[PDB]
Design an enzyme around this catalytic site. Structure first.
Site, PDB file in Angstrom:
ATOM      1  N   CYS A   1     151.525   9.716  10.906  1.00 53.94           N
ATOM      2  CA  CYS A   1     151.709   9.917  12.344  1.00 53.94           C
ATOM      3  C   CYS A   1     150.502   9.551  13.176  1.00 53.94           C
ATOM      4  O   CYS A   1     150.594   9.414  14.399  1.00 53.94           O
ATOM      5  CB  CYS A   1     152.097  11.360  12.620  1.00 53.94           C
ATOM      6  SG  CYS A   1     153.579  11.779  11.694  1.00 53.94           S
TER       7      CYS A   1
ATOM      8  N   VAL B   1     171.312  16.855 -10.586  1.00 53.02           N
ATOM      9  CA  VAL B   1     170.734  16.825 -11.930  1.00 53.02           C
ATOM     10  C   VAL B   1     169.692  17.919 -12.139  1.00 53.02           C
ATOM     11  O   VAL B   1     168.701  18.005 -11.406  1.00 53.02           O
ATOM     12  CB  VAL B   1     170.095  15.458 -12.252  1.00 53.02           C
ATOM     13  CG1 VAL B   1     169.449  15.485 -13.639  1.00 53.02           C
ATOM     14  CG2 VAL B   1     171.134  14.354 -12.173  1.00 53.02           C
TER      15      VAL B   1
ATOM     16  N   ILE C   1     163.138  15.797  -1.631  1.00 52.24           N
ATOM     17  CA  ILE C   1     162.671  16.323  -0.349  1.00 52.24           C
ATOM     18  C   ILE C   1     162.212  15.167   0.538  1.00 52.24           C
ATOM     19  O   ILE C   1     162.081  14.031   0.075  1.00 52.24           O
ATOM     20  CB  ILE C   1     161.463  17.266  -0.553  1.00 52.24           C
ATOM     21  CG1 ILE C   1     160.311  16.499  -1.205  1.00 52.24           C
ATOM     22  CG2 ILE C   1     161.840  18.457  -1.428  1.00 52.24           C
ATOM     23  CD1 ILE C   1     159.008  17.294  -1.283  1.00 52.24           C
TER      24      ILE C   1
HETATM   25  C1  LIG Z   1     152.669  12.710  10.668  1.00 42.17           C
HETATM   26  C2  LIG Z   1     153.448  12.834   9.348  1.00 42.17           C
HETATM   27  C3  LIG Z   1     153.076  13.973   8.338  1.00 42.17           C
HETATM   28  N1  LIG Z   1     152.361  13.422   7.195  1.00 42.17           N
HETATM   29  C4  LIG Z   1     151.563  14.100   6.386  1.00 42.17           C
HETATM   30  O1  LIG Z   1     151.377  15.286   6.425  1.00 42.17           O
HETATM   31  C5  LIG Z   1     150.992  13.255   5.250  1.00 42.17           C
HETATM   32  C6  LIG Z   1     149.625  13.686   4.762  1.00 42.17           C
HETATM   33  N2  LIG Z   1     149.631  15.001   4.115  1.00 42.17           N
HETATM   34  C7  LIG Z   1     149.404  15.259   2.827  1.00 42.17           C
HETATM   35  O2  LIG Z   1     149.230  14.426   1.958  1.00 42.17           O
HETATM   36  C8  LIG Z   1     149.356  16.771   2.513  1.00 42.17           C
HETATM   37  O3  LIG Z   1     150.224  17.443   3.392  1.00 42.17           O
HETATM   38  C9  LIG Z   1     147.923  17.351   2.570  1.00 42.17           C
HETATM   39  C10 LIG Z   1     147.281  17.198   1.190  1.00 42.17           C
HETATM   40  C11 LIG Z   1     147.035  16.643   3.599  1.00 42.17           C
HETATM   41  C12 LIG Z   1     147.930  18.823   3.011  1.00 42.17           C
HETATM   42  O4  LIG Z   1     148.385  19.745   2.042  1.00 42.17           O
HETATM   43  P1  LIG Z   1     148.775  21.303   2.442  1.00 42.17           P
HETATM   44  O5  LIG Z   1     149.763  21.319   3.503  1.00 42.17           O
HETATM   45  O6  LIG Z   1     149.379  21.931   1.122  1.00 42.17           O
HETATM   46  O7  LIG Z   1     147.468  22.073   2.929  1.00 42.17           O
HETATM   47  P2  LIG Z   1     146.039  22.148   2.209  1.00 42.17           P
HETATM   48  O8  LIG Z   1     146.135  22.310   0.751  1.00 42.17           O
HETATM   49  O9  LIG Z   1     145.329  20.788   2.588  1.00 42.17           O
HETATM   50  O10 LIG Z   1     145.301  23.481   2.837  1.00 42.17           O
HETATM   51  C13 LIG Z   1     144.586  23.532   4.079  1.00 42.17           C
HETATM   52  C14 LIG Z   1     144.994  24.727   4.986  1.00 42.17           C
HETATM   53  O11 LIG Z   1     146.329  25.118   4.768  1.00 42.17           O
HETATM   54  C15 LIG Z   1     146.294  26.510   4.277  1.00 42.17           C
HETATM   55  N3  LIG Z   1     147.548  26.780   3.626  1.00 42.17           N
HETATM   56  C16 LIG Z   1     148.386  25.874   3.186  1.00 42.17           C
HETATM   57  N4  LIG Z   1     149.444  26.480   2.714  1.00 42.17           N
HETATM   58  C17 LIG Z   1     149.283  27.768   2.859  1.00 42.17           C
HETATM   59  C18 LIG Z   1     150.065  28.772   2.540  1.00 42.17           C
HETATM   60  N5  LIG Z   1     151.190  28.468   1.970  1.00 42.17           N
HETATM   61  N6  LIG Z   1     149.709  30.019   2.789  1.00 42.17           N
HETATM   62  C19 LIG Z   1     148.492  30.253   3.400  1.00 42.17           C
HETATM   63  N7  LIG Z   1     147.682  29.195   3.738  1.00 42.17           N
HETATM   64  C20 LIG Z   1     148.106  27.961   3.451  1.00 42.17           C
HETATM   65  C21 LIG Z   1     145.032  26.570   3.498  1.00 42.17           C
HETATM   66  O12 LIG Z   1     144.630  27.925   3.292  1.00 42.17           O
HETATM   67  C22 LIG Z   1     144.388  25.669   4.204  1.00 42.17           C
HETATM   68  O13 LIG Z   1     142.904  26.277   4.735  1.00 42.17           O
HETATM   69  P3  LIG Z   1     142.052  26.072   3.864  1.00 42.17           P
HETATM   70  O14 LIG Z   1     142.332  25.033   3.078  1.00 42.17           O
HETATM   71  O15 LIG Z   1     141.664  27.254   3.134  1.00 42.17           O
HETATM   72  O16 LIG Z   1     140.633  25.808   4.417  1.00 42.17           O
HETATM   73  C23 LIG Z   1     151.583  13.835  10.752  1.00 42.17           C
HETATM   74  S1  LIG Z   1     149.933  13.463  10.210  1.00 42.17           S
HETATM   75  C24 LIG Z   1     149.715  13.204   8.725  1.00 42.17           C
HETATM   76  O17 LIG Z   1     148.938  14.464  10.707  1.00 42.17           O
HETATM   77  O18 LIG Z   1     149.506  12.089  10.814  1.00 42.17           O
HETATM   78  C1  LIG Z   2     154.071   5.251  12.288  1.00 41.39           C
HETATM   79  C2  LIG Z   2     154.773   6.557  12.043  1.00 41.39           C
HETATM   80  C3  LIG Z   2     154.649   7.595  12.969  1.00 41.39           C
HETATM   81  C4  LIG Z   2     155.304   8.805  12.754  1.00 41.39           C
HETATM   82  N1  LIG Z   2     155.165   9.834  13.669  1.00 41.39           N
HETATM   83  C5  LIG Z   2     155.834  11.019  13.472  1.00 41.39           C
HETATM   84  C6  LIG Z   2     155.671  12.061  14.370  1.00 41.39           C
HETATM   85  O1  LIG Z   2     154.990  11.919  15.397  1.00 41.39           O
HETATM   86  N2  LIG Z   2     156.322  13.252  14.132  1.00 41.39           N
HETATM   87  C7  LIG Z   2     157.096  13.420  12.996  1.00 41.39           C
HETATM   88  O2  LIG Z   2     157.670  14.491  12.784  1.00 41.39           O
HETATM   89  N3  LIG Z   2     157.230  12.397  12.090  1.00 41.39           N
HETATM   90  C8  LIG Z   2     156.589  11.202  12.309  1.00 41.39           C
HETATM   91  N4  LIG Z   2     156.715  10.188  11.383  1.00 41.39           N
HETATM   92  C9  LIG Z   2     157.573  10.374  10.164  1.00 41.39           C
HETATM   93  C10 LIG Z   2     156.893  11.113   9.018  1.00 41.39           C
HETATM   94  O3  LIG Z   2     155.720  10.433   8.630  1.00 41.39           O
HETATM   95  C11 LIG Z   2     157.854  11.166   7.839  1.00 41.39           C
HETATM   96  O4  LIG Z   2     158.965  11.976   8.176  1.00 41.39           O
HETATM   97  C12 LIG Z   2     157.185  11.759   6.609  1.00 41.39           C
HETATM   98  O5  LIG Z   2     156.105  10.923   6.253  1.00 41.39           O
HETATM   99  C13 LIG Z   2     158.191  11.819   5.461  1.00 41.39           C
HETATM  100  O6  LIG Z   2     157.555  12.175   4.251  1.00 41.39           O
HETATM  101  P1  LIG Z   2     157.989  11.466   2.867  1.00 41.39           P
HETATM  102  O7  LIG Z   2     157.187  12.050   1.719  1.00 41.39           O
HETATM  103  O8  LIG Z   2     159.469  11.636   2.625  1.00 41.39           O
HETATM  104  O9  LIG Z   2     157.718   9.907   3.115  1.00 41.39           O
HETATM  105  P2  LIG Z   2     156.231   9.292   3.184  1.00 41.39           P
HETATM  106  O10 LIG Z   2     155.277  10.256   3.848  1.00 41.39           O
HETATM  107  O11 LIG Z   2     156.368   7.972   3.897  1.00 41.39           O
HETATM  108  O12 LIG Z   2     155.826   9.100   1.631  1.00 41.39           O
HETATM  109  C14 LIG Z   2     156.612   8.362   0.729  1.00 41.39           C
HETATM  110  C15 LIG Z   2     155.703   7.685  -0.294  1.00 41.39           C
HETATM  111  O13 LIG Z   2     156.428   7.386  -1.477  1.00 41.39           O
HETATM  112  C16 LIG Z   2     156.027   6.118  -1.955  1.00 41.39           C
HETATM  113  N5  LIG Z   2     157.084   5.552  -2.798  1.00 41.39           N
HETATM  114  C17 LIG Z   2     158.322   5.090  -2.420  1.00 41.39           C
HETATM  115  N6  LIG Z   2     158.973   4.665  -3.534  1.00 41.39           N
HETATM  116  C18 LIG Z   2     158.168   4.847  -4.608  1.00 41.39           C
HETATM  117  C19 LIG Z   2     158.321   4.586  -5.972  1.00 41.39           C
HETATM  118  N7  LIG Z   2     159.436   4.034  -6.448  1.00 41.39           N
HETATM  119  N8  LIG Z   2     157.296   4.892  -6.838  1.00 41.39           N
HETATM  120  C20 LIG Z   2     156.123   5.445  -6.366  1.00 41.39           C
HETATM  121  N9  LIG Z   2     155.974   5.700  -5.011  1.00 41.39           N
HETATM  122  C21 LIG Z   2     156.981   5.406  -4.159  1.00 41.39           C
HETATM  123  C22 LIG Z   2     155.753   5.305  -0.698  1.00 41.39           C
HETATM  124  O14 LIG Z   2     154.843   4.254  -0.951  1.00 41.39           O
HETATM  125  C23 LIG Z   2     155.176   6.355   0.238  1.00 41.39           C
HETATM  126  O15 LIG Z   2     153.765   6.353   0.173  1.00 41.39           O
HETATM  127  C24 LIG Z   2     156.077   8.984  11.615  1.00 41.39           C
HETATM  128  C25 LIG Z   2     156.192   7.949  10.690  1.00 41.39           C
HETATM  129  C26 LIG Z   2     155.552   6.737  10.913  1.00 41.39           C
HETATM  130  C27 LIG Z   2     155.693   5.633   9.898  1.00 41.39           C
END
Ligand SMILES: *[C@H](CCNC(=O)CCNC(=O)[C@H](O)C(C)(C)COP(=O)(O)OP(=O)(O)OC[C@H]1O[C@@H](n2cnc3c(N)ncnc32)[C@H](O)[C@@H]1OP(=O)(O)O)CS(C)(=O)=O
Ligand SMILES: Cc1cc2nc3c(=O)[nH]c(=O)nc-3n(C[C@H](O)[C@H](O)[C@H](O)COP(=O)(O)OP(=O)(O)OC[C@H]3O[C@@H](n4cnc5c(N)ncnc54)[C@H](O)[C@@H]3O)c2cc1C
Ligand SMILES: *[C@H](CCNC(=O)CCNC(=O)[C@H](O)C(C)(C)COP(=O)(O)OP(=O)(O)OC[C@H]1O[C@@H](n2cnc3c(N)ncnc32)[C@H](O)[C@@H]1OP(=O)(O)O)CS(C)(=O)=O
Ligand SMILES: Cc1cc2nc3c(=O)[nH]c(=O)nc-3n(C[C@H](O)[C@H](O)[C@H](O)COP(=O)(O)OP(=O)(O)OC[C@H]3O[C@@H](n4cnc5c(N)ncnc54)[C@H](O)[C@@H]3O)c2cc1C
Ligand SMILES: [Cl-]
Ligand SMILES: [Cl-]
Ligand SMILES: [Cl-]
Ligand SMILES: [Cl-]
Ligand SMILES: [Cl-]
Ligand SMILES: [Cl-]
Ligand SMILES: [Cl-]
Ligand SMILES: [Cl-]
Ligand SMILES: [Mg+2]
Ligand SMILES: [Mg+2]
Ligand SMILES: [Mg+2]
Ligand SMILES: [Mg+2]
Lengths: 437, 437
Positions: A42, A268, A274
């Site tokens: 995002c 399965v 998810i």
């Molecule tokens: C646009 C799309 C959304 N995309 C993404 O989120 C993709 C990138 N994210 C990831 O790969 C993972 O979500 C990461 C690894 C970044 C985050 O993992 P977690 O959500 O499990 O959190 P984390 O382990 O990094 O912990 C940090 C913060 O969360 C607290 N915490 C998490 N879960 C709990 C629960 N269940 N209960 C209590 N506290 C929790 C944790 O304590 C924590 O604080 P601390 O780590 O202690 O310092 C959006 S985008 C990506 O922003 O562009």
């Molecule tokens: C530019 C952009 C902006 C966005 N902005 C917003 C926002 O503002 N708000 C919001 O709610 N959502 C936003 N989204 C959507 C959000 O990022 C997705 O809903 C979220 O990432 C979904 O998580 P996911 O794990 O299902 O897919 P992803 O986060 O995309 O992860 C899927 C991963 O699986 C990998 N993969 C696929 N097939 C295979 C395979 N066969 N073997 C190994 N790996 C594989 C891919 O390479 C990819 O890295 C945005 C998305 C994009 C692209």
């Protein structure tokens, strides 16, 4: 158990992290087909616009850091190419060696998400945006070619955010879309401010327009027009990454998604799904729902974590479909069933347009709030809000209302937090309730 | 029915208008003791601050317009001095001529609100703020006297708003308060940014401080300090305007308020009471409540209108006490039982401090959100939030949750509207739910 996860971003890396939080002894491995795990999907448009410039914001982890903090093994450039569910293995292709192999599992978690569609032109100047590799390539093409003029194709939130960011970077984008149905998660008549913001900034756009031919930088359009562009970004929808799943016993729908139950189980045993790949149902109405957004991915990640290693009484209750996008000065937000799903109900609509706060408080802007409800039980079906101020607040409140099966009439009872900078003694939400009478 | 209303502002004018919407036949007369009806009490500090320069903003109606548009008779400078409840008349003093008379009624609606307390000093430089007459007087006094140094007494939310406005006008205020309990609807520890904003601007303040004596412009304080001030604005609490009621059969509590039922009825037939004068109960717990704010005045006005002229099954369901104030860059909001009322419950507290929106998105700031829950049932008792951004949104959502007696654990399920400028995939509200284990 031995846990295999497919995909290392929003659903995958989160789910694996949540599992480790609960279970410190299970072995966990993630396969990711591309270069990076945990990238910030995002954030991507803001990286392009140079709003975000620290790479520590574009990418949360490397596989090395991930292992060292969480003891989770992440193999990048590993593409899973088949699921052998009967022997409980996946077949994996190491893209660096082009060697494939089997990996076993006690539990498999699928979060492959979706890929960007392409128009299919043979073109060196055309890009899609889905990951950080994409983002790096665009930033590089811009610099190496001194790009000024960019064509943006598509009108969903991705294309809209890219456009705005390209503009702020100092480039000159033009937006086209194949039809006039822009930003389609929002009520069609409530999207006018998108066009106004373009006009205000003298950003050209053409709707009912398509690329017809491409020859170098010379772009020929369906309208008969011909111009020159340095670059093109296509945002023309996505498709599910489920091809590798088709040979398995996993049930897919005709569009390539994976129907799951409230524990995010597939048909399965021991296989979960998810994120964008999974479909489920609405919370507030008995209809199927697919909501490929960040919230659903993270929530399912937590639910699957509880199922495998925590409290398996914890189950999904369905989607509401809350979503939002910023475009220049305006916010566009909706929740509930999609516009096209309304016809399945006998509904009525109520709406109000009003200052987000006190008129005499400086900085006011009108806020349009619209709510649809079911005539047979007065339940809220959908709401949408657009304005420069206050739209996110209104929609989150209505999201909580729908979670609790509130009626439209009960909105008169919503006790808002009121002072002049924030709202009104009878808030827009209250007025929806009064007007439904 | 012939309807008589006492007081022509938040409760009274609103209630009269709401009745007319439903009933075009009944004769309605409102008595207002002062010059103006329908002034914007809430706008008054911003008038002093010259943020609101145009009176049309400070006054919503005149008796003349109210009659042309609504056919309701409003008599200003008419003070109701007695309620003759057995014969169903009120005694009314025409303040212009000093002659009194009786006005009959079939229904009587009391919304006389509250008056500002005074410290009781004999002083020509001391003012309270309750209406538009008070505002014109303050504005005139500053101009006439070229006021620079101003002593603001009291640290309630109104006084803080006044202080901020005096400051932005170019004046030099000093804040004092008899105790350290500033802005007392908010958790005490969460009020620190008020003091930070004052410090940041070199605006002096002294807590646990009081005026000892006033000698012209020379003020002697409880601390022993003596300073010179051109002007004093006292915000030292309010008292109910119920003196004109004590001789009647209407039941008053010992502080001078009127307990009402959920139809906003007094103990006396055909007499209703609404607005700051009335007391009720909480919606989410079985405790008495008094919430002297705008939302309650407007909500009661509608319910009383329905009782008299509409659907009389519509009843109040109690207060949650949602409240908010802005002070310089910070927002302070809370909802649920007051801090002092927590001790009637076995409770626990959960809290998070996190960015209001995505970290990489610019203009981010830490938002502190705190939630109290009852251990016997997991139900949310109180919530508070402080920060430059996002506090109003989280508190409104939690108000909607508490309205439904939602548990702290279910916040986990709240489906937020997520994009980077607005929140997180797991919002602070979801995080409260996850942290409640
Ligand atoms: C646009 C799309 C959304 N995309 C993404 O989120 C993709 C990138 N994210 C990831 O790969 C993972 O979500 C990461 C690894 C970044 C985050 O993992 P977690 O959500 O499990 O959190 P984390 O382990 O990094 O912990 C940090 C913060 O969360 C607290 N915490 C998490 N879960 C709990 C629960 N269940 N209960 C209590 N506290 C929790 C944790 O304590 C924590 O604080 P601390 O780590 O202690 O310092 C959006 S985008 C990506 O922003 O562009
Ligand atoms: C530019 C952009 C902006 C966005 N902005 C917003 C926002 O503002 N708000 C919001 O709610 N959502 C936003 N989204 C959507 C959000 O990022 C997705 O809903 C979220 O990432 C979904 O998580 P996911 O794990 O299902 O897919 P992803 O986060 O995309 O992860 C899927 C991963 O699986 C990998 N993969 C696929 N097939 C295979 C395979 N066969 N073997 C190994 N790996 C594989 C891919 O390479 C990819 O890295 C945005 C998305 C994009 C692209
Ligand atoms: C701070 C302190 C609070 N103070 C006040 O409220 C000041 C005193 N207020 C009043 O005197 C009344 O509230 C006035 C007379 C200002 C307003 O009367 P009400 O009926 O609210 O409103 P009105 O008749 O003016 O209607 C305007 C708007 O709302 C619609 N409407 C009102 N009631 C309903 C119902 N029940 N159902 C549907 N619609 C209703 C109405 O039609 C009209 O809409 P349009 O704009 O044409 O759509 C706060 S502060 C701000 O400083 O005072
Ligand atoms: C400066 C200020 C700022 C405020 N800011 C906020 C805010 O930001 N948010 C919020 O929620 N609330 C705010 N409030 C409170 C809000 O104004 C009150 O809750 C609301 O006005 C209550 O309405 P009411 O009808 O009971 O009393 P009022 O609106 O005060 O009206 C009562 C009227 O009755 C008249 N009256 C009294 N006795 C008689 C009599 N015997 N005969 C005839 N007339 C009589 C009075 O002269 C007065 O005009 C603020 C109040 C003030 C003073
Ligand atoms: Cl590794
Ligand atoms: Cl191997
Ligand atoms: Cl094997
Ligand atoms: Cl289309
Ligand atoms: Cl249902
Ligand atoms: Cl008259
Ligand atoms: Cl006169
Ligand atoms: Cl903001
Ligand atoms: Mg850079
Ligand atoms: Mg096979
Ligand atoms: Mg002025
Ligand atoms: Mg419940």
């Amino acid at each position: 158990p031995k846990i295999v996860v497919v995909g290392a971003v929003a659903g995958g890396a989160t789910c694996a992290s949540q599992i480790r939080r609960l279970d410190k002894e299970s072995d966990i491995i993630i396969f990711e087909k591309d270069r990076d795990m945990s990238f910030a999907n995002c954030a991507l448009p803001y990286v392009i616009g140079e709003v975000v410039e620290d790479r520590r914001y574009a990418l949360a982890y490397t596989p090395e850091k991930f292992y060292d903090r969480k003891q989770i093994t992440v193999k990048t450039y590993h593409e899973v190419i088949a699921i052998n569910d009967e022997r409980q293995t996946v077949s994996v292709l190491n893209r660096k060696t082009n060697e494939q192999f089997e990996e076993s599992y006690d539990k498999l978690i699928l979060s492959p998400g979706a890929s960007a569609n392409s128009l299919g032109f043979e073109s060196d100047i055309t890009f899609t945006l889905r990951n950080l590799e994409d983002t790096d390539a665009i930033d590089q093409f811009i610099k190496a070619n001194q790009v000024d003029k960019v064509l943006v194709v598509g009108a969903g939130y991705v294309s809209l955010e890219v456009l705005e960011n390209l503009y702020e970077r100092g480039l000159h984008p033009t937006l086209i879309h194949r039809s006039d149905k822009i930003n389609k998660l929002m009520d069609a008549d409530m999207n006018q401010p998108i066009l106004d913001e373009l006009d205000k900034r003298e950003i050209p756009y053409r709707l009912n327009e398509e690329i017809n031919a491409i020859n170098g930088n010379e772009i020929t359009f369906k309208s008969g027009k011909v111009e020159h562009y340095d670059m093109i970004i296509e945002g023309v929808g996505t498709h599910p990454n489920s091809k590798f799943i088709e040979s398995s016993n996993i049930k897919l729908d005709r569009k390539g998604f994976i129907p799951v139950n409230d524990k995010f189980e597939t048909n399965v045993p021991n296989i979960y799904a998810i994120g964008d790949i999974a479909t489920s149902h609405y919370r507030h109405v008995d209809l199927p729902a697919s909501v490929p957004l960040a919230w659903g991915a993270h929530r399912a990640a937590s639910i699957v974590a509880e199922q495998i290693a925590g409290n398996d009484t914890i189950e999904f209750k369905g989607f509401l479909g809350n979503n939002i996008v910023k475009f220049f000065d305006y916010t566009f937000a909706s929740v509930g069933v999609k516009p096209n799903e309304l016809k399945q109900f006998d509904y009525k609509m109520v709406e109000v347009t009003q200052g987000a706060h006190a008129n005499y408080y400086p900085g006011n802007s009108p806020l349009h709030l619209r709510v649809y409800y079911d005539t047979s039980n007065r339940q809220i079906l959908r709401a949408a809000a657009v304005g420069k101020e206050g739209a996110d607040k209104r929609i989150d409140v209505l999201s909580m209302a729908m979670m609790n099966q509130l009626t439209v009439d009960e909105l008169t009872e919503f006790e808002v937090a009121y002072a002049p900078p924030y709202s009104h003694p009878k808030d827009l939400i209250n007025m929806i309730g009064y007007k439904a009478k």
